[PDB]
Amino acid sequence: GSKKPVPIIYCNRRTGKCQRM
Amino acid sequence: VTGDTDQPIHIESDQQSLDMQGNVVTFTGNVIVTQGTIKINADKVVVTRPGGEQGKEVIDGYGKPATFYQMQDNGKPVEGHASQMHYELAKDFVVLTGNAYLQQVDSNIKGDKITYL
Numbered sequence A: 001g002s003k004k005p006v007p008i009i010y011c012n013r014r015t016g017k018c019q020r021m
Numbered sequence B: 001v002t003g004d005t006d007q008p009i010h011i012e013s014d015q016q017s018l019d020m021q022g023n024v025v026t027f028t029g030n031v032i033v034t035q036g037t038i039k040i041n042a043d044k045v046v047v048t049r050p051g052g053e054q055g056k057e058v059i060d061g062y063g064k065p066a067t068f069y070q071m072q073d074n075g076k077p078v079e080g081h082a083s084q085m086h087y088e089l090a091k092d093f094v095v096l097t098g099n100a101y102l103q104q105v106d107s108n109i110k111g112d113k114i115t116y117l
Helices: none
Strands: A009-012 A017-020 B010-013 B016-019 B024-035 B040-047 B061-069 B079-087 B101-103 B108-110
Touching: B024 B061, B040 B079, B040 B108, B079 B108
Parallel strands: A009 B010
Antiparallel strands: A009 A017, B010 B024, B016 B024, B024 B040, B040 B061, B061 B079, B079 B101, B101 B108
16 A cells, blocks of 8 residues: 655644644 | 645644644644545544654544535535544545444445444
């Protein structure tokens, strides 16, 4: 199997910020 | 959208509780996991990460009926719902639990305890 992931980003509605893992 | 899964997943939550090491990122308080045109709605999502590898954690969320809604880009609207939802970049298997009903364009996987062979 081939693994092709993506940069998963955590977003917070409270502060309005998105921090990529 | 062209390719949803080809785009970076966005976990929209009100509470971002990130462990200092990064062992676990707790998402609570109505979580909206959106991927392209797909919109998943849960209440509690637990993303665990040993620390280091990024792009493949484990989308494990439950609580509110996790619906699998998608805008009809093909004219056909996607609909789904369960008590627990699971998605992974490597493990391409939607493991749902509790009143699990999911169909892609016409069908997909439905039951309650979604288990494979």
